[PDB]
Structure 1
Amino acid sequence: SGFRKMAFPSGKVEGCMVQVTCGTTTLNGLWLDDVVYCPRHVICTSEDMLNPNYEDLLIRKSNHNFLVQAGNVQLRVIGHSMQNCVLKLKVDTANPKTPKYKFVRIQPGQTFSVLACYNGSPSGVYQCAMRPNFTIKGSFLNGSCGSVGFNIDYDCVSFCYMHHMELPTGVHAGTDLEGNFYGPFVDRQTAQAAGTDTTITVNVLAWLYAAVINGDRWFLNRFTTTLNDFNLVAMKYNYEPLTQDHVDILGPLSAQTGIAVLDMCASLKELLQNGMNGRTILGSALLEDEFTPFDVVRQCSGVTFQ
């Protein structure tokens, strides 16, 4: 028993991290087969960040302007191209530690692990969620650009996030591995702010099920509600509306605890209207929304990986 913010083991990703330098700027790259992926703003100078024209900036570069280092070994850049907001650097050597992988775009509310890196060197691993406003509440210092986010499906690493920038509110924005931004953000220094965030309701419900599995039961009650009555209360408190698909996703947790979803919704409705009154749930005094139903099952039933 117990419940922790649990990340995926990072070994398979650590062996893909490299350092990429172009001019004065150094950041992190992802080396898979014979391609290194990194944020395209590695080719910008201080004067260019304001209003960069990436097509011009790239045509003025040649392969030898790009220093790629994998630990001590230097990688020779054979070619380069731009795919949306990512630079693809073809190198002479394929990474022998390339895992089975795929590139997937995740949806708001889904979680992944982040391997925070500096100078091509892994520093720490942590779990976070893609927020409904398409930012992540990460922990990143200068030099962390090109750090990646990922999930593991059995033997396969699904890369879903590459870090590009920090917004003025301290939250973080990036792209999928095809270079397409999550959210309405651009890789130029402008006056872009995140829109209004909401609480991920299906995740809060999954976490309440985790609590029940771990012996926290004080918030339960005998009532039941309907989807529409709950959603009426949810909207008032800036909670995402709940759908039938969400109810279905929660099925396995309903089954294991014998507590119907709509039953759990009535507890949630009560917590939203009265608060928690100095009581905690799984060691928290706030409702936690960064565990998916799948995270809970995995941690409260025990799936491993390659």
Structure 2
Amino acid sequence: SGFRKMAFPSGKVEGCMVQVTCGTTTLNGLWLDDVVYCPRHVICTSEDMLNPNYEDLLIRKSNHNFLVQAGNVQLRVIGHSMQNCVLKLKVDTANPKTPKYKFVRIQPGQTFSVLACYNGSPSGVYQCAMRPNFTIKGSFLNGSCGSVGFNIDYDCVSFCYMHHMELPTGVHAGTDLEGNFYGPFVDRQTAQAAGTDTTITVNVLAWLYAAVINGDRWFLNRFTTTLNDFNLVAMKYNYEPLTQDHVDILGPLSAQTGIAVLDMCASLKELLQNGMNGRTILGSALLEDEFTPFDVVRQCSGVTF
């Protein structure tokens, strides 16, 4: 037992990271089959990022202006194109280490592993969540752009995120692998507001189930609540409304613990209204919302890949 923020094993993805240089800038790209993907701002000088015309900037570039390195293997660029905010570089070699893979656009509240990368070499792996305002709380320095986020199901890597920018908040923003930003963001160095964020209620409930499974029981009370009355308190404390869809997704956890979902909501209610009183739940003094119901089941049942 025990409960940790656990990332997927990163070996499948490590074999796809390459270094993409154009001009002076170097960042990471994703090498799948004979295509390398990376953020289009690799083609910008520091002055362009204030107000970049990416189409005009790309036209000044040809295949040989792109240096792609996979370790020391120097890939030859034989084609380049823009898809939204990603550059696709056609290379003469298919990646032999290519995993079975999908490109997925994930939904707010879902989680994914990030393989943080510099100069085409992996540095570390950690778990993130897509916040409701389509940002992530990552750990990214200069040179990390092009690092990817992913999930794994048995053998198939689902790529969902590529890193592009850090906001003024210290939060992070990026695209899916078709190059469409999550959220309202553009790849321009001008002030950009992230919306108001809120707490992912179905994830907090799933983490309370994990707590109960592991013996942390003190917050279970003798009360209950309705969906509409719980939602009244959730709006008051900036929580997503709970829907019957969320209730259904919590079925597996509800069934394994014999605690009804609305019983667990009444515990959350009392935690929100009365705080934690200095006690902890699974070692945290705050309510955790970075664990989906699938994350809890995978860790409490032992699913492998």
Q: In structure 1, what is the Cα distance between the partners aligned to 2:76 and 2:267? A: 59
Q: In structure 2, what is the Cα distance between the partners aligned to 1:22 and 1:269? A: 53
Superposition deviation, residue 279 in structure 1: 0.7
Q: In structure 1, what is the Cα distance between the partners aligned to 2:240 and 2:26? A: 39
Q: In structure 2, what is the Cα distance between the partners aligned to 1:103 and 1:31? A: 13
Q: In structure 1, what is the Cα distance between the partners aligned to 2:16 and 2:166? A: 23
Q: In structure 2, what is the Cα distance between the partners aligned to 1:46 and 1:172? A: 19
Superposition deviation, residue 194 in structure 1: 1.1
Q: In structure 2, what is the Cα distance between the partners aligned to 1:180 and 1:19? A: 22
Superposition deviation, residue 193 in structure 1: 2.0
> Which SS does the other structure have where 2:264 is aligned?
helix
Q: In structure 2, what is the Cα distance between the partners aligned to 1:128 and 1:179? A: 19
Superposition deviation, residue 57 in structure 1: 0.7
Q: In structure 2, what is the Cα distance between the partners aligned to 1:225 and 1:35? A: 53
> Which SS does the other structure have where 2:301 is aligned?
coil
1:58-109 Cα offsets, whole Å, 9 max, x none, are 1111100000000011000000000000000000101000000000000000
Superposition deviation, residue 191 in structure 1: 1.2
> Which SS does the other structure have where 1:181 is aligned?
coil
1:246-296 Cα offsets, whole Å, 9 max, x none, are 000000100000000000000000000101101100000000000000000
1:16-67 Cα offsets, whole Å, 9 max, x none, are 0000000010000000000000000000111211111111111111100000
> Which SS does the other structure have where 1:145 is aligned?
coil
**Structure 1: runs of 5 or more not aligned:** none
Q: In structure 2, what is the Cα distance between the partners aligned to 1:34 and 1:202? A: 40
Superposition deviation, residue 228 in structure 1: 0.1
> Which SS does the other structure have where 1:127 is aligned?
strand
Superposition deviation, residue 223 in structure 1: 1.3
Aligned residue number for residue 127 of structure 1: 127
Superposition deviation, residue 183 in structure 1: 0.2
**Structure 2: runs of 5 or more not aligned:** none
Superposition deviation, residue 198 in structure 1: 0.2
Superposition deviation, residue 14 in structure 1: 0.2
1:97-154 Cα offsets, whole Å, 9 max, x none, are 0000000000000000000000000000000100000000000111000000000011
Q: In structure 2, what is the Cα distance between the partners aligned to 1:221 and 1:49? A: 54
Q: In structure 2, what is the Cα distance between the partners aligned to 1:195 and 1:246? A: 23
Superposition deviation, residue 222 in structure 1: 1.7
Q: In structure 2, what is the Cα distance between the partners aligned to 1:16 and 1:271? A: 44
TM-score by length of 1: 0.99
Superposition deviation, residue 168 in structure 1: 0.7
> Which SS does the other structure have where 1:49 is aligned?
helix
* Farther off after superposition, 48-57 or 3-12: 48-57
Q: In structure 2, what is the Cα distance between the partners aligned to 1:203 and 1:177? A: 25
Q: Is 1:298 the equivalent of 2:298?
A: yes
> Which SS does the other structure have where 2:158 is aligned?
strand
Aligned residue number for residue 157 of structure 1: 157
> Which SS does the other structure have where 1:276 is aligned?
coil
Q: In structure 1, what is the Cα distance between the partners aligned to 2:276 and 2:162? A: 37
> Which SS does the other structure have where 1:300 is aligned?
helix
Q: In structure 1, what is the Cα distance between the partners aligned to 2:279 and 2:61? A: 60
Aligned residue number for residue 141 of structure 2: 141
Q: In structure 1, what is the Cα distance between the partners aligned to 2:46 and 2:196? A: 30
Q: In structure 1, what is the Cα distance between the partners aligned to 2:270 and 2:191? A: 40
Question: How many percent of aligned residue pairs carry the same amino acid?
Answer: 100
Q: In structure 2, what is the Cα distance between the partners aligned to 1:22 and 1:276? A: 52
Superposition deviation, residue 224 in structure 1: 1.2
Q: In structure 1, what is the Cα distance between the partners aligned to 2:180 and 2:232? A: 34
Q: In structure 1, what is the Cα distance between the partners aligned to 2:249 and 2:169? A: 33
TM-score by length of 2: 0.99
Superposition deviation, residue 300 in structure 1: 0.2
Superposition deviation, residue 195 in structure 1: 1.2
